[PDB]
Ligand binder design. Structure first.
Ligand SMILES: Cc1cc2nc3c(=O)[nH]c(=O)nc-3n(C[C@H](O)[C@H](O)[C@H](O)COP(=O)(O)OP(=O)(O)OC[C@H]3O[C@@H](n4cnc5c(N)ncnc54)[C@H](O)[C@@H]3O)c2cc1C
Ligand SMILES: Cc1cc2nc3c(=O)[nH]c(=O)nc-3n(C[C@H](O)[C@H](O)[C@H](O)COP(=O)(O)OP(=O)(O)OC[C@H]3O[C@@H](n4cnc5c(N)ncnc54)[C@H](O)[C@@H]3O)c2cc1C
Ligand SMILES: NC(=O)C1=CN([C@@H]2O[C@H](COP(=O)(O)OP(=O)(O)OC[C@H]3O[C@@H](n4cnc5c(N)ncnc54)[C@H](OP(=O)(O)O)[C@@H]3O)[C@@H](O)[C@H]2O)C=CC1
Ligand SMILES: NC(=O)C1=CN([C@@H]2O[C@H](COP(=O)(O)OP(=O)(O)OC[C@H]3O[C@@H](n4cnc5c(N)ncnc54)[C@H](OP(=O)(O)O)[C@@H]3O)[C@@H](O)[C@H]2O)C=CC1
Lengths: 401, 401
């Protein structure tokens, strides 16, 4: 079942969470983690916010305290694994044996093919190294072009604007945050960023670039000092594909984290997995999934009577004045709006229903309502829609029933 | 690896092919097959053609000669399996032990929700029982409505027209065969069926029905004596889902037929698997996949040095005067047309290319060209596009190089 020794590939949040849970659950056998970045394991969300702005990496490290007696092979790349021999080949020339192999290799940013041969700075934002490079190439009154209106681009937009950087943003879709956000939220978010001076360009794609100017598909030009591309990520599933595991931009796993290869597990951003709400497989890229799927897989490995991973997806995104929280599905057959949707001290809550049942929720600058909404979502609650809209209703009270 | 005893769930083409290959490859341990239909195992394509027209089921049975010493439990439903206990629970009250479990349970037709409460005959066409019922409810000059312009509906359309049945066909898409057919082929096929008297209704959906009349979304009505619904199939993956395997309208498998559950394999229509051409996972519903994936999985189970399943997808469809064969992707960046596309003695070949490389092909009434085109497709050939178009070119010769 859980067979020693355990080897984990990747040393991000998912991996750290997994190995800390193994220890906490009582596994005392060998754990070796292989991490290609030569960095003390660290959390990524500050890279678009407080780290980007203030630059102290020692405030963003992950705590490995709950993972004692782990050897972390930092700055080392796993090059292949042989699932028959039960071995992993490392870039430093060593080989690791394993009883259980855990793939927690995450995802890497998609490149924009039309900027491949560019002769101006073009960066993506995923690592400490990326953050440091983008940080050092921006100055107040510089001109930053962001490609992609996802949460990373928008988080960077906010931070750049606060620093006095002029920001343009090109998005292929008619709206921002098309991945996992209610249209009502996306529209408001566009309203917010436009008011903070972001120059938004919708339904535009980059067709190429020439000597410091980016070219768009509507025949026009944008001049920038730097391009940051944030058009999503792609699973780091190369080792899995080579070794014969089922993959498709992500390693297919069940609720136990099992791949199609015996004794090989996967978790976090690298996985394609079931979303219990939609009942479909999806590659979930959220911080909460990385942590929670990692814990769930570990728990069940040590104690096979534990249930499989069962959490419903949620995320937050901090974008300047907007502290955004989103849980569940972006849409249902009904949206209930609690509060006013206003740039004047923004504060509101959205609730998505499907046939009377809560299937998703959004809070903007309203954390207190988000926890109880997540509880209602989990148990498939069907509150009175009238009470859901009524400002006088205590969602915390409601949730407690 | 291959651990006795072997239990297979489902007794269709995929299952028969799998168990015959196990025997041929040298496995001599127990094989028990559980098949819910109380029928000698049989092939389905004649159900829309020669069986529908002539009604002799003894011409459509699968040969189990190459699968000696197999117990076929016909008319028995597997209700669950316990992958820990390594047992399968049967509807007759018995339990089967297994060393290796193989899920070959196929797929069932999708129902049309707007006809659920209908009070006129509404059938789907998948089994011998379906065929017999549709057969007995049609008469010459009866009015048949077919919902769905896939190969099954079109095959039935042809057979019904030949029998003197009036046929209407409603399709949601602007074209027929939207699943896996080049647009050039689909357009011609519509031309053919219209000329044979089929009343085609595109971009229409059924909204319901009232007392022998079907209602459409454009506010209109179609009167028919019988509706046959052919809007695709859904994987029979219930046992897999309950048992904790990764599934999403189909059981995820790698090229060895492995699911995410140790000692459980799956093959045929029930599987979601990698299409090597598109590099994406797909549920492939072709006869050739059922047979060939079943053989490939068996071969590798007996002999683990054998390669995994590697075939590229292809199918045929016999529709009246049109003997259609299609291999690979429906489209690339270029289509080459060999011959004239004409209702006057139809005979032509399409070739789809992607950056010089053959990625798909179609033959209509030209079997001799289809085999060599499949060989060129397999090795990713890049023939001179000029020679591909030139009528004087021998594709068989070309393929032999
Ligand atoms: C700029 C930024 C802002 C973010 N803000 C938010 C946010 O507002 N909200 C939110 O929910 N999430 C946010 N995220 C955080 C995010 O969701 C987590 O970082 C992520 O989900 C963690 O997943 P992971 O541990 O599986 O993968 P990763 O963090 O990618 O870790 C995988 C590691 O494995 C390494 N690796 C890959 N292949 C190999 C190999 N062969 N050998 C060794 N190592 C290998 C990778 O390089 C990587 O270091 C943000 C991320 C970024 C980059
Ligand atoms: C009308 C018709 C026309 C066709 N014509 C074409 C064609 O022109 N071209 C083409 O390429 N293909 C055609 N097909 C044939 C087709 O592609 C094959 O029949 C199919 O791919 C076989 O897949 P299978 O063996 O995996 O599944 P199936 O044939 O569905 O066999 C699975 C069996 O398992 C049974 N089962 C499911 N659950 C359980 C359980 N819990 N316990 C026991 N048994 C269970 C099912 O009832 C079924 O009998 C046609 C099919 C039909 C119905
Ligand atoms: N469910 C989840 O997994 C969610 C994850 N997050 C976060 O998302 C982050 C990563 O994604 P991010 O970088 O922000 O970008 P996104 O994945 O959000 O994508 C942003 C936009 O880029 C567009 N795009 C994608 N591909 C291309 C392309 N080839 N050319 C031009 N445009 C393209 C997309 O449009 P289009 O749709 O047309 O391709 C999309 O509108 C992760 O860090 C994660 O934390 C946030 C919410 C939910
Ligand atoms: N690659 C493969 O797997 C292929 C399999 N085949 C054969 O396909 C057969 C089964 O499919 P078949 O029954 O013919 O139908 P199809 O899967 O071909 O679908 C036919 C049409 O039905 C429409 N449709 C689907 N769902 C609905 C719905 N809920 N309401 C209204 N219309 C809908 C589809 O449109 P829409 O797209 O909008 O949903 C589609 O255009 C199998 O027997 C197999 O042999 C043939 C070629 C390739």
């Amino acid at each position: 079942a859980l067979k020693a020794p355990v080897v984990v590939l990747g040393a991000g949040l998912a991996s750290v969470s997994f190995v800390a849970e193994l220890r906490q659950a009582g596994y005392q056998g060998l754990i070796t983690v292989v991490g290609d970045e030569a960095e003390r394991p660290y959390d990524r969300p500050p890279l678009s916010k407080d780290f980007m702005a203030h630059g102290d990496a020692e405030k963003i490290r992950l705590d490995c305290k709950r993972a004692p007696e782990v050897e972390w092979l930092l700055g080392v790349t796993a090059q292949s694994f042989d699932p028959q021999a039960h071995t992993v080949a490392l870039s430093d020339g060593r080989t690791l044996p394993y009883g259980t192999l855990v793939l927690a290799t995450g995802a890497a940013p998609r490149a924009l093919p039309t900027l491949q041969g560019a002769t101006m700075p073009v960066h993506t934002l995923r690592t400490l190294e990326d953050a440091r490079r983008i940080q050092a190439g921006l100055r107040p009154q510089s001109r930053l072009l962001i490609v992609g209106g996802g949460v990373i681009g928008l988080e960077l937009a906010a931070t750049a604007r606060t620093a006095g950087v002029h920001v343009s943003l090109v998005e292929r879709q008619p709206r921002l945050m098309s991945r996992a956000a209610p249209a009502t939220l996306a529209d408001f978010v566009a309203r917010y960023h436009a008011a903070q001076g972001v120059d938004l360009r919708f339904e535009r794609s980059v067709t190429g670039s020439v000597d410091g100017v980016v070219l768009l598909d509507d025949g026009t030009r944008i001049a920038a000092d730097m391009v940051v591309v944030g058009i999503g990520v792609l699973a780091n599933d190369a080792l899995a594909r080579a070794a014969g595991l089922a993959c498709d931009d992500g390693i297919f796993v069940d609720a136990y984290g099992r791949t199609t290869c015996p004794d090989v597990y996967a978790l976090g951003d690298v996985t394609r997995q079931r979303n219990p709400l939609s009942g479909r497989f999806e590659r979930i890229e959220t911080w909460s999934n990385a942590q929670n799927q990692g814990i769930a897989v570990a728990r069940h490995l040590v104690d096979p009577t534990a249930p499989g991973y069962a959490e419903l997806p949620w995320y937050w995104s901090d974008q300047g004045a907007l502290r955004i929280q989103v849980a569940g599905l972006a849409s249902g057959d009904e949206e209930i709006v609690r509060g006013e949707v206003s740039l004047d001290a923004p504060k509101f809550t959205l609730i998505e229903l499907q046939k009377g049942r809560i299937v998703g929720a959004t809070c903007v600058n309203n954390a207190r309502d988000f926890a109880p909404l997540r509880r209602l979502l989990a148990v498939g609650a069907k509150p009175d829609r009238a009470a859901l809209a009524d400002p006088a209703t205590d969602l915390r009270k409601l949730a407690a029933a």
